Amino acid sequence: NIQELQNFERWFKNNLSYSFSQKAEKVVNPNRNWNDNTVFDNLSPWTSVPDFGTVCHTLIGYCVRYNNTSDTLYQNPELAYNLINGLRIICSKLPDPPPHQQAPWGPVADWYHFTITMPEVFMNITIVLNETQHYDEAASLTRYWLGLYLPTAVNSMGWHRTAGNSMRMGVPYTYSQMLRGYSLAQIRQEQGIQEILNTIAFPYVTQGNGLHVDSIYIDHIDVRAYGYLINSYFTFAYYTYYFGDEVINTVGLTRAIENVGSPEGVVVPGVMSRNGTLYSNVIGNFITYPLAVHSADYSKVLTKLSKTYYGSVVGVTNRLAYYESDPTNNIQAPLWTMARRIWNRRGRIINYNANTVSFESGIILQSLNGIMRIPSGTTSTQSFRPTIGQTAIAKTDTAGAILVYAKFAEMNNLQFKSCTLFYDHGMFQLYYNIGVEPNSLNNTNGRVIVLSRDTSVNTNDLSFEAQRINNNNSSEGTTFNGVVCHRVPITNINVPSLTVRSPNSSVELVEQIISFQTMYTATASACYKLNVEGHSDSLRAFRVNSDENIYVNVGNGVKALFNYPWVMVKENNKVSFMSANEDTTIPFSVIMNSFTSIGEPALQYSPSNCFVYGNGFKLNNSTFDLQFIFEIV
């Protein structure tokens, strides 16, 4: 099996830099100085497990440097020596026998790094030095010590492992078996590897952990949670190599990443980690992203990636958590439920912090400071289902609309109907029927954020207040980080003017103040649009016959209709409808009424993905997507 082993090592070295660009936990281009006692200077790895983790990552980083043709220390013999010497030092400190359900040092739960990161150290060092005098020793050290610390693909130090952990473990484990002379064909049949194969298959599921039918990744039972997928994504290429293209649902996973990510690494915060983050430094390297509008009709995500912006809305369904908190992070629900923002792709990536995470375009504030706490009632995490969650999504070639009806018990019974439309090159947002529990706001007006900025970040925009005053004391056309805001009036709907306010020292806002009286009656409303800086349009919105029948004409070939429970988008020869009740038949009367509303009563249409059934049309297939698509003349 020597050629199989050598082919793999060749492949590993060829793809190392690329693979590293996908790996979430790493230290890039390390320059830390070498130390004979602690591997590197200024760390205490033998007492502090976090420092041991740093030692491990740094060694791996140095392997990447050694292997990188463009790096100054490419194939450098002294670095090769430092790497093997570093491994020798680590090996000299490892208990033998390995402990049973204890970390070699530190407390339990500091087991990570010994099980996860350390075997990766053995693998990286051994392979990158495979053409050197150090290879046999490195390989022998790996065979011995991984034989102890990773005796199977799924067991380490007396513990059985699953999910992302097992995905990490299987890669150096499989390599360790290859070093022992076993073929990939034999390794595949091992009980532990079989578990991992099940874990990485990612079949479509309708509920619980895994890849839901519409390619949104769910974890912790009911949480949109890409942080976990992101962590072990780099391992997929290894399993595909080891065991063939067929062992992973590549189509499903690719679509999952398309549905939330972007090349710049910007990701809608409602699917990201609990601290409140819109950025991953690896997700952009997972796939080649198309310019497209994506929708997940069951899990409730609408995402658009254009040449100029990334925009996304996480909707709300009673089937999934709207929020997940932990003992530290508990103020992120507004961001997860109400972010209605486009990010200029050429803009600065400003990530949230404790002082700014309560503020984003689209967030409805119930207080001046905006803090809305939902504590975890367990000793670790807790996820929360919404009281009401019904969401419809409709998309065409370049446009997509999302219509959300939600009520959140833990956010003072906050409810709303939310209407969002993404198009080239902007986003329309209308909230109506905004409500909170009557008499709960202590005579304080609510406010809907239109634009927000972290004041510590020096973009080259003047402050919102300075821009307002320069612009004849109007906040219309206020710009931040490559995005421009405008108020959108709708005759017979209350749309407050844009005003500027600094809540805390770290934040400045443009917002629409809404009366607490209308919030009490669940009749409050707000309406704005964002444009990519340098782009403008003549978007107009209209109330037609009824408060809930809202027709948007972007004026550039895109029309949308929000008529709860139905949403519709029309662009060129395509029309898409969806019901927030997730109906699999659409009545012809809904179609006729919709076409009348948008000023095209005689529109000629025929079904594209549905068929004449009962009082209208039934979806050809409702397993994955719930939009009725028609071709028009």
Curated annotation (Swiss-Prot):
InterPro entries, sorted: Baculo_ODV-E66_core, Chondroitin_lyas, Lyase_8_alpha_N, ODV-E66_C_baculovirus
Protein's name according to its UniProt entry: Non-sulfated chondroitin lyase E66
Protein location: Virion membrane; Host nucleus; Host cytoplasm
GO terms of molecular function: lyase activity
Function (record text): Component of the polyhedra envelope. Plays an essential role in oral infectivity. May digest, with its chondroitin lyase activity, the chondroitin sulfate barrier of the peritrophic matrix of the host midgut to facilitate viral infection in the epithelial cells.
EC number of the protein: 4.2.2.-
Pfam families: Baculo_E66 (PF04850), Lyase_8_N (PF08124)
Keywords attached to this entry: Host cytoplasm, Host nucleus, Lyase, Membrane, Signal, Viral envelope protein, Virion
Enzyme class: lyase
Effect of residue 220 to A: Complete loss of non-sulfated chondroitin degrading activity
Originating organism: Autographa californica nuclear polyhedrosis virus (AcMNPV)
Site (Transition state stabilizer) residue list: 274
Similarity comment: Belongs to the baculoviridae E66 family.
GO CC term (a single one): viral envelope
Active-site annotation: 165 (proton acceptor), 220 (proton acceptor), 228 (proton donor)
Site (Important for catalytic activity): residue numbering on this chain: 324
